[PDB]
Each structure stands twice: as structure tokens, then as C-alpha cells.
Amino acid sequence: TPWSKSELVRQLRDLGVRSGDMVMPHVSLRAVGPLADGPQTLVDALIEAVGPTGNILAFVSWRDSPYEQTLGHDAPPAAIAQSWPAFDPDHAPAYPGFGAINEFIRTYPGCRRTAHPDASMAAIGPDAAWLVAPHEMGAAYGPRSPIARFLAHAGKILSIGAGPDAVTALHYAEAVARIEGKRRVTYSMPLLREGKRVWVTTSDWDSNGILDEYAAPDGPDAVERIARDYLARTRVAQGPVGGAQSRLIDAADIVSFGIEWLEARHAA
Ligand SMILES: CC(=O)SCCNC(=O)CCNC(=O)[C@H](O)C(C)(C)COP(=O)(O)OP(=O)(O)OC[C@H]1O[C@@H](n2cnc3c(N)ncnc32)[C@H](O)[C@@H]1OP(=O)(O)O
């Protein structure tokens, strides 16, 4: 029998979600189980849990991000630059690999979208416009990014049946950690400025592994190793959301743990 919206709200209340919270969810819909009206039931429950003054922030990215097609080039290759669609924030579908719930979040009425096509975040609430902008190329997940403002607003990370590798907020820890040999990447994104399509090439921290030893694809990255060490040492509210084992993590605490984690293992 499918979970109802009221049942999910009660579970979110037991986990510790309160009205007015700023919550960032990472969801495995298969772990949640069948819902009354599909994935929209969980979206409605999250919005009711945080209340009218609460906020939802999701890393949704973009289904058609030309990341690999422009990686390692000082400019988009000719075939990519001439035909790739421009990133239209209010019309770009989310990246499916990060969870099918994100396409329901980004299409919710009133949801805002950041202008960074590869690191695009979706936000719902009174602080959505403040979270969503600015999000310029070269500041994907570090300072001046929605994650940075999320960390400065007592944000909570809601892992619903998702693995420790999904903690997007830990990309901020990699960005500011004073360690040696941090990996950087160069790619190009097609932006939409005043209806005109503009290619922007930038360099930023490698979000697929900040260090060489964490960047192998077979393959736990620095995010997974930090999150596993954190969850093995920290008391965190845990309980069911639907059929999924869930965690409500203090974002500022796990990021401070991540900075100390990286700086303790690598010289400056
Ligand atoms: C450090 C970083 O930044 S990592 C980047 C950010 N990544 C994240 O946030 C990921 C968080 N989520 C996770 O980690 C999860 O474990 C995942 C997404 C990787 C895998 O979990 P899954 O449950 O297998 O994927 P998902 O959440 O999308 O749900 C899949 C179900 O939704 C279904 N579905 C897909 N689209 C729709 C749709 N429009 N309508 C209804 N159902 C849909 C799929 O068919 C599937 O159902 P099925 O069992 O019948 O095949």
C-alpha cells in the first residue's frame, strides 16, 4: 500500500524536520517505495514539512550539460559551439542520474533555478531567489555559490535512502581546503543572457575528485570518504521516510568536518 502525504510528513517530523528549516534532499525513489501519487507525493510532503517560511534546495544540474564535450579545451569545439542548446533555466530538465525526484522539484510552481548549467540548483521558498543567484561560472560549489549561502543559513542535508557519495555540500569543503595538488578542470557552458546565447569558458575545482587518489572512477571520491568517516563518528537523526532509511545532517557541521578531514591528510 502506497505511502500517503500525511504519513511522510509525520516521518519527516520524527526525523527532526521542523517548519522553517532549509533542507537539501538527496533521494532514492526506489528506496522510498510506491507513493500515493508518484514522486510528487514526496515533494508535497517536503514542502509541508518545512512550512511556508522554510526552503528546499536541490542540486539538479542539467540533462544536456556539455561538460564532457568541452572538458579540457580553452573553448567549445566547433561542432559543439555551433549547435548546442543554450541553458534556459526555467526550461532545462534536470540530470536524471542525480535522482528522478529533481525533475519534480524543478517543475514545482515558484521554483527557481541557478544560471550555472552544470552545477544548477533548484530552490523553493522565500529564500529561493537569494539561494539561486548569483551562480557564476568558476564558482560551482565553493564561495559565492548556492551551497555557500546554504551553509550560511543553517541548512540541513536530508539523505533519503541515498549513499554517502551524494553529499553535494561537501564540494564546498574541497573548494576551500588548504591542501596541495587540488585538481582543477576547464569546460565551457552555453549561457542565456538577455535571450542571447553566450559561451562561457571557465576553470573550477574538479567536482569528480579534488585529488588524484580520490578521482579514480572505481572509485570512491573524496565526498564519499568524508561522509562515511563523518557518519561513523557523529550522532545523526536517523529514521524512515517511506521505506528508505534516512538521515538529517547538519550541513555546516559536516562541511567543517570535511575541511578538517582534508587538511589533516594532505600538506598545504
Ligand atoms: C557529491 C555530489 O554532488 S553527487 C551529485 C548529486 N547526486 C544526488 O543527489 C543523488 C541522490 N540520490 C541517490 O544517490 C540515489 O541512490 C540514486 C538516484 C543515485 C539512485 O537511486 P534510484 O532510486 O535507483 O533512482 P531514482 O531516485 O531517480 O528513482 C528511480 C525510479 O524513479 C522512476 N521514474 C523516473 N522518472 C519518473 C517519472 N517522471 N515519473 C515517475 N517515476 C519516474 C524510475 O522509473 C524508477 O522507478 P522504477 O523502479 O520503476 O524503475
Q: What does the DSSP assignment read for 32-75?
A: H--BEEEHHHHHHHHHHHH-TT-EEEEE---TT--HHHHTT-SS
Domain count for the chain? 1
Q: How far apart are CA 45 and CA 65, in angstroms?
A: 30
Atom of ligand 1 nearest to the CA of 26: 11
Q: Hey, whose CA ends up nearest to atom 49 of ligand 1? A: 30
Q: Is 120 in the pocket of ligand 1 (CB under 6 A)?
A: no
Q: Is 125 in the pocket of ligand 1 (CB under 6 A)?
A: no
C-alpha cell at 199: 559561451
Instruction: Give the end-to-end CA distance of the chain in Å, rounded to a whole number.
Output: 54
On whether the CB atoms of residues 150 and 251 are closer than 8 A, the answer is yes
Atom of ligand 1 nearest to the CA of 141: 3
Which of 115, 110, 143, 142 minimizes the C-alpha distance to 127? 110
Header resolution in angstroms: 2.0
Class of residue 24 by CB neighbours under 10 A (exposed 0-12, middle 13-18, buried 19+)? buried
Contacts 24+ apart (CB under 8 A), 225-230: 226/167, 226/170, 226/173, 226/254, 226/257, 226/258, 226/261, 226/262, 227/164, 227/165, 227/167, 227/170, 227/254, 228/164, 229/257, 229/261, 230/254, 230/257, 230/258, 230/261
Question: Which of helix, strand or coil describes residue 118?
Answer: coil
Q: How far apart are CA 131 and CA 84, in angstroms?
A: 27
Atom of ligand 1 nearest to the CA of 100: 28
Q: What is the experimental method?
A: X-ray
Q: How far apart are CA 80 and CA 230, in angstroms?
A: 41
Q: At which residue does the C-alpha cell 573550477 appear?
A: 204
Does the annotation list 234 as a binding residue?
no
Range of the domain at 1: 1-268
